[PDB]
Amino acid sequence: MILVMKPYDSLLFREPRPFDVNNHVARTILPLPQTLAGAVRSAIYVKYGSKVKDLIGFGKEEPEFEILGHFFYRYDGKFELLVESPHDVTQNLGLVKPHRIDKLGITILMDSEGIKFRPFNGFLKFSGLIDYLQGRIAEDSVVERQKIFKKERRVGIALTKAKVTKEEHFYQVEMLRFSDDCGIAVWVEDGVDFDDEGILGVGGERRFVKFEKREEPECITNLRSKWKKIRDKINETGRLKIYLATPAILGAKGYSSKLDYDLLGDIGIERVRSVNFIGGKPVIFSGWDFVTRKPKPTRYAVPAGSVYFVEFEGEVKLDMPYLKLGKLTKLGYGLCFMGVW
Template sequence: MIVKITPNDVLFFRESRDFTAGDSHLAESLLPLPHTIAGALMAVMFVKGRYDLLNLELKEGKFRKPENWKPNFEIIGTFFMKKNELYFPVPKDIVSAKADGRSIITMAKLKEVQIGGQSFTTVFAEGESPLHFSPVSGFLSFEKLKSYLNGEYYSKNDLSEEITKNSSLYKWENRVGIGLNSSKTTVEGMFYRTRMLRLEKDTAIGIVLSKKNLDEVKKTLGKKGTLKLGGEGRFAHYEIIDEDPLEELEEISVKKNALFKLYLATPLIVDGQSWNIAEVLPEHINAKIVKVFMDRPEKITGWDLVKRRPKETLYAVPPGSVYILKAQEDLTLKPFYRLGMMVELGYGLVFAGKYG
């Protein structure tokens, strides 16, 4: 099931640290993280009195979270949607290179080379200068992501037409403001600027839910409704789409010593600091990491409403990251895995894919 959220206005998502116009003149929105979107959905459940779904305990008139708290429903992931189709961050092994005097988008490939009697794995891209390439930003629709995971892109010369640009889904909108005191008059030195997130026409945010207590979630949310989203609590409306697109994916068989890939559809929190996915792989995946394509880690912050203080800052491997692994034995891989911390809030969704 997908909860499709369509904002009525611009949105603002930010770190949990305070913003004071006098201390900083610029407040920039981030792209929404899974737990932020999950929080908006849980707020609807809280208002409707479904404390059981939120796994909250009411003691002495105050709500408390049990130790090692988790909600009693699960989010598989949160994504942008366009005309009811999910969109995923471009995999980091899709790169831009020069060919025939122009830029093309192609797959980065691995090659073993011998130097001084030792074997090394290098990365190259088809083009005029195979060792010189740059990352690509954008998104793949779910249909195109399936082609990528099936290894079909390795045989294509230019993938430019496969990529959906960021600007097709959202844009950044700058606004200015000035601080007011309690009497609604301006305060000197409190001029500031904000960068807001505006979704483009037909673009929404999709929350993919697991089957855990799904009937109760449906009963609570109804077919449609409204919620508050982002740091300024802007209104958005939601509707339920009774589909599970991930059911279309199939298992992958990998022979011993063959390469395969793991693609991160949502941020992966290994332990709050590490990038090493091997630490959280299921035991049946006996494989060795050969190469990693990733960007800088993402900071995961938030505000604990029960304890009324910022949550501990964790660092996640960003979505779009790709791990290339070598199977140490014959493997049968599930279409996707949910790995690491906070998977119940939409983190750690990892798809298995073919290499070559």
């Protein structure tokens, strides 16, 4: 099931910069999964009181009910779902694959049209996700970032008693102005009890939305149906591609980008020949624990859209077109589709 969350106005998922008296500026980033997870958990917990403390996982860092991930969406004539653009797509909408030249002992990941390329910023339609997993990126399956939302800026000032500007009472913030008929959508595991309609306050500065529960669309069911074909193709080729739809915390004790083969062994892969990780800058993030009313430990996460190219010996045994990764999985982290490269 999904939760269509049309925002009333701009929202602010603040960056971890402190809001000091002198440091009175703020900037918004793309919404992290943990914020939406916390919002949904609070919405369920408050309505049903303390009797659902175990389900909400009160105090604990993880709940019991499952949240898969969050995609963006819009209503361009139809309810369209969009995900982050993978880092392996060039501006010319051309895929990028490794071309390891064993003669020189290198593993260059150069594209098919040169050894230099820059990732295509934007979003990939969920309808085209199957084609991308099959390495057949179309031309009308992607849209840029500015067509969905544009960042806006605001100022604020706290007045003194009568009419003058109070000392140390000036601030400036920056928020996300979603375009018309373009909001967020949280993907929740089926079976979790939730109210149908209402409102929910997400993010800082006390901003709300108009959340509405909806069943899964046709795109996800189509992907699930074709997953078996994708899986047998991957088994035949021996070259499996992993694409990340949400940030992941794949690091072991001490966060790191080294994809440990132990997680890969659980999917049926026996021997991992090689791993080629292409990503971007790490994401540093820490939340605000309500129970202790204190900031959470900082965590570094692989940015969304990173691609892992793996050549393997064995068979993939998953019956689902996606696989969870890392820790804090229930919050919606580490959602990764698998395709053929």
